[PDB]
Swiss-Prot record, chain B:
Range of the intact protein held here: 141 to 207 of 209
Cell compartments where the protein resides: Nucleus, Nucleolus
Family indicated by similarity: Belongs to the NOP16 family.
Source species of the chain: Schizosaccharomyces pombe (strain 972 / ATCC 24843) (Fission yeast)
Protein name listed in UniProt: Nucleolar protein 16
UniProt subunit comment: Component of the pre-66S ribosomal particle.
Function in brief: Involved in the biogenesis of the 60S ribosomal subunit.
Curated annotation (Swiss-Prot), chain C:
Family the entry assigns: Belongs to the eukaryotic ribosomal protein eL8 family.
Record note on quaternary structure: Component of the large ribosomal subunit (LSU). Mature yeast ribosomes consist of a small (40S) and a large (60S) subunit. The 40S small subunit contains 1 molecule of ribosomal RNA (18S rRNA) and at least 33 different proteins. The large 60S subunit contains 3 rRNA molecules (25S, 5.8S and 5S rRNA) and at least 46 different proteins.
Record GO terms (molecular function): RNA binding; structural constituent of ribosome
Main localization, broad class: cytoplasm
Official protein name in the record: Large ribosomal subunit protein eL8
Complete-protein stretch covered: 69 to 236 of 259
Originating organism: Schizosaccharomyces pombe (strain 972 / ATCC 24843) (Fission yeast)
Curated annotation (Swiss-Prot), chain D:
Quaternary structure, from the entry: Component of the large ribosomal subunit (LSU). Mature yeast ribosomes consist of a small (40S) and a large (60S) subunit. The 40S small subunit contains 1 molecule of ribosomal RNA (18S rRNA) and at least 33 different proteins. The large 60S subunit contains 3 rRNA molecules (25S, 5.8S and 5S rRNA) and at least 46 different proteins.
Annotated keywords: Cytoplasm, Ribonucleoprotein, Ribosomal protein
Protein known as: Large ribosomal subunit protein eL36B
Record PANTHER family: 60S RIBOSOMAL PROTEIN L36 (PTHR10114)
Protein family (similarity comment): Belongs to the eukaryotic ribosomal protein eL36 family.
GN (gene name): rpl3602
Molecular function in Gene Ontology: structural constituent of ribosome
Domain of life, per lineage: Eukaryota
Curated annotation (Swiss-Prot), chain F:
Other known facts: There are 2 genes for eL15 in S.pombe.
Annotated organism of origin: Schizosaccharomyces pombe (strain 972 / ATCC 24843) (Fission yeast)
UniProt keyword annotations, A-Z: Cytoplasm, Nucleus, Ribonucleoprotein, Ribosomal protein
Composition bias type Basic residues, residue spans: 142-152
Pfam families membership: Ribosomal_L15e (PF00827)
Region (Disordered) location: 134-153
Family annotation (Gene3D superfamilies): Ribosomal protein l15e
SUPFAM superfamilies according to UniProt: Ribosomal proteins S24e, L23 and L15e
Gene Ontology annotations of biological process type: cytoplasmic translation
Keyword GTP-binding: no
Its biological purpose: Component of the ribosome, a large ribonucleoprotein complex responsible for the synthesis of proteins in the cell. The small ribosomal subunit (SSU) binds messenger RNAs (mRNAs) and translates the encoded message by selecting cognate aminoacyl-transfer RNA (tRNA) molecules. The large subunit (LSU) contains the ribosomal catalytic site termed the peptidyl transferase center (PTC), which catalyzes the formation of peptide bonds, thereby polymerizing the amino acids delivered by tRNAs into a polypeptide chain.
GO molecular function: RNA binding; structural constituent of ribosome
Protein name per Swiss-Prot or TrEMBL: Large ribosomal subunit protein eL15A
Keyword Ribonucleoprotein: yes
Amino acid sequence: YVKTWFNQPGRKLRRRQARQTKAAKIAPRPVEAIRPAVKPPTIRYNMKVRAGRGFTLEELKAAGVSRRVASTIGIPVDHRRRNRSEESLQRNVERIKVYLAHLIVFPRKAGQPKKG
Amino acid sequence: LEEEAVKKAARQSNKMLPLSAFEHAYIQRLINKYGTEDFESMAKDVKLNSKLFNGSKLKNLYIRMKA
Amino acid sequence: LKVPPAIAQFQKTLDKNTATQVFKLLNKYRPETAAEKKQRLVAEAEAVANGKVSKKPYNVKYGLNHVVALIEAKKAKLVLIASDVDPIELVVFLPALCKKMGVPYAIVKNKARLGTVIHQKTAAVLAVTEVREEDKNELASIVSAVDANFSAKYDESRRKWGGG
Amino acid sequence: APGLVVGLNKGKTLTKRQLPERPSRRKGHLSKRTAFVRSIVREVAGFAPYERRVMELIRNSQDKRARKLAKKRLGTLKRAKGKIEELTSVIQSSRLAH
Amino acid sequence: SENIQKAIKEMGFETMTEIQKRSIPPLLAGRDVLGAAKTGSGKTLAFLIPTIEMLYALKFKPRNGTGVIIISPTRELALQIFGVAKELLKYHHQTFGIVIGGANRRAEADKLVKGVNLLVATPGRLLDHLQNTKGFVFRNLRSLVIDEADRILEIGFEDEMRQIMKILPSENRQTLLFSATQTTKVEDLARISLKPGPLYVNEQGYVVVDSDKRFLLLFSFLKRNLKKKVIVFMSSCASVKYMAELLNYIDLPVLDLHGKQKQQRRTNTFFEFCNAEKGILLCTNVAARGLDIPAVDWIVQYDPPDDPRDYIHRVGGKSLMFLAPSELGFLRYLKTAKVSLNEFEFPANKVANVQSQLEKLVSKNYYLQQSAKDGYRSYLQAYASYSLKSIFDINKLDLAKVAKSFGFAHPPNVNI
Amino acid sequence: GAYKYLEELAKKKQSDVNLFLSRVRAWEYRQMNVIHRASRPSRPDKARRLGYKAKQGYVIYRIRVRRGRSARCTAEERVGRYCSNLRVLNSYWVNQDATYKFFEVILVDPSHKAIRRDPRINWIVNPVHKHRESRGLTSIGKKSRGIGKGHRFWLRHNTLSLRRYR
Amino acid sequence: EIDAGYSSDSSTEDPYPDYDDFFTNTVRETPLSSAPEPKRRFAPSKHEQKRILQLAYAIRKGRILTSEQRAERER
RNA sequence: UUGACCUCAAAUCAGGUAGGACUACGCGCUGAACAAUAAGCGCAGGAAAAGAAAAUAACCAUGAUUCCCUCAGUAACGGUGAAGCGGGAAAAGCUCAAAUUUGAAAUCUGGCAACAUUUCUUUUGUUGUCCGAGUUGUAAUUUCAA
RNA sequence: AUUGGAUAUGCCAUAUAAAGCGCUUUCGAAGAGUCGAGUUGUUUGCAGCUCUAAAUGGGUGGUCAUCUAA
């Protein structure tokens, strides 16, 4: 079998139309969730900083965001990752704190019974 | 967008709750015997505190009754 | 065939006289039916809908997970095990657990009879945890009878392989 | 502004943090109730034919043959050593009771 | 700071005692002090106020970890200190905590990882946590306090204390030491722990009653002596709280030095008891340690004392001791102390047979049952921490009989 | 609870109590059909942890297979064919002897309203779960085809991928 | 040393015993679980109070016939 | 004896459901020749499968699955031939078993009667009542991240 | 004409309720004819057969790290 790439420009267009389709549904919030900053796990790459999967629970507790609130305002949680050093904790705590500064959370209507 | 969020949050800000007929009569009876400051002995009275509410729940009941 | 002692013990059940006296106490503490429970709750509902504090209820304890937890908590005064549980390994440890926890226990006949006390088709085990002050002597006399007619009796027989 | 700069570095300075113990790492710890349940069941269930034979050899002080039989049945040494210790205490408890 | 003063005046503490004259001022400068004071001199405020100042001065936070470690020989003394430190830190934000022997070790580990700035510890439990507990941040240790150092040495924690000093950092860390008596072991420990050049500061009645009848005899005795002055000594504050609550629940109004663990209430209760011509007060040995005993017709030792050497000197109206048959070996120790004694005899008929009703009252009430478990557990743990292992052996104690005295049909599940 | 005692008793499969019950029930099961309905599971602890609830829509079936492919996989498939209107949830080992291995298969009725209204077993109603045992989607079926995570466990390497710009 | 010898077992050169209670001969005096007792066992049931409020609601809405008017409908 | 329970059957009893076809892609089982090869057999969907670590690593550590690029025609093996890292597309997490609701099976199907609702007189529910299921365990609560 | 997610607003709301965070002198269950061992076949995995477990245990890696199967 020989795989051909004639749909390469048609996949590019289809993926872009999905981003536009996604943005139409969720109008003002970002098309991606904020990702942490981590360091790759080798002696070849540990100097580089890249994006992680989600923020650790210890990073969210320091930033002031609970693990149940976090998912609702676009902050992924990684229950697996941990902070073995204070630099990873502070690098990503500041990342969450900056995110909260630039964030507008629209209020939600709440059911409110008469008494009690 | 920011103007709408603050004004709407101000409109939906009535977070304090009133008391129902049972809730008011419940907390009122506890206060009439133990005053308004001793909530620890208020929770330990099995006769009047049938639901066994702790001091923190009874404190929140009194606060909601004040307003 | 030859049966192990832990399964052989279920063929030696409580005698007819003691079992009949046991169920006289049990029938005083039947749980309220689905109909009687609804009547009591709707009666309190009208006292709330229009306008208006009790004692702890008294009933016999049932359920295999519930009763085993009560024995482990030493809350059970008398445990009555059905003699014909379809998978025997459901109650095959109960006489040993009751021995370890010092719970007076008996193996009674007709798991259906146990279910009738609790308004159910079937009960694997019944347990009396704590009864009214009027029935303290009646339960105490039953526990003494179970000691003599079940524990003092058999006992040496329950450690022997049955059948064959 | 929210933005991640990927590549280069962020800082070579290091400060090791002490991490707590995760709940999954607690697995295998013996419970007070599980130890009770196993003691009741072990007595109630009885013993396997190979456990009866192993118990016989320990009673006759032929521990060399007992350990060999347990390993031949169970498969490894540390499984045989654990079974012998479990059955030895059963004998000791039986002797104290009887 | 003003927060320290606002907390201190809440306790009703004014002026400042004599032992604190040579300790509190120099210690506020961060210099090592070798204190030495007798019982009841008020050392609890001596090594707590300056240390709490130093927490505020350095702006410590739970992420920093433990900064001050206070070591006490017994559960009751550590708990009493922890209760005082809670009062002093009422208007603070620095976290405080206690780790003790016989307590929930798993729960303590969860509290230690969160960050406890002011830790009150026992030598046995602290070494266990310092070696095994993960996430326990103590590299930023700055102050170390030892109270009743001689008591620690006599207990048998010399080996445990040695490893604590080897594990805990020694640089730039303030250290303290308090001992009623200065022995060779006390001096040796000070030389290896304290910094060089420190600022040095300077007739019996008993009733042989079984465990199950301990409370029933006590209750009947108090009913008989309702027209006198009675003071009862217990082995714990939790035991004090439960019996005081239970006695008021059976129409025998009493007073206790517990209150709500408020220092001002205890002084108020003691002052009222002294002023009153008749009444009954319950307290533990540590609470009454060093206090002024008023003119009391009856003193009752409901539970055996944890410091027999101090007790035999404190006694020197009438003295009573509730001694179990398994504790009859304490009688031989009295002869070695050369103290006259007499045996009290009581008839079994006159003892109140309310045990069945007592169990029903405890089982029906949530708070009575909760207090009964806490009192029973603390009494057993204090029993296991007694200095006289040979005399007051916990293993020889019958746990089924003991739980009967607390109003339990069966012994509750308490660990150690 | 009693499922702690039942599940620790199920580890001593050759003990006196378990051996007698294994041989007594193996004879009883041989007098019955090859595939027969079970009124209640013979291992209420093991069925309960495999997804079985004592409620309408949950069915237990016993089946014997000859000893000497996976024995448990064939039991799931044979019972699934026997009860074509049910969905095979899971299965387990109940008994064995010198000739036969006995298994109990948990099936769920995708048409019963007590199943279709229960969100925790609502997933089995979807058509993508038609004959899960037939496509190796059960617990033993997944294990049979070496599905798992790790180094212990084709088309994208036998093909030439020619891009547009190459 | 182990003498590198043989023990006559190397390949190279009561069927029905009585029940033995080695654990249940004694009686455990304390409960097995040390967990604290929840307050729900010393307070009126909250499950029933849920139903009572639900029944009291539908009595106001007229969904369930009250006891006094149940008898009138019967006769 | 009456009578409950467990069975074992029966009914042109009520309500349901399975088969066959397609099969490009998909998932199983089976299999020669010149290789999971064609065939043969079994089973799905609009995708399927996989999937929230009994996973990698040895680092300043990473973090479900899937696909693409790279690693790499490399290690390894005996010409076959990966994977970790790295770069992208997309991102979402959760549910049970094992706890006594025990101060109250709090749970569910069905019949019947009303009241609604509709892609729809064709659909889908609500409320009430009775019966059944269920204590050999149905709800609430908990899933280790706790 | 049929619909979807929001907005605004009227009415109803069984809240004596239900949650997140915080703190502990109290607790914390974790899946077996499986794992594994021997051996025989298919293509390490899988399968049969004989045997058959544990509880800081078990798996996979380099005393340590990581994971938490059935």
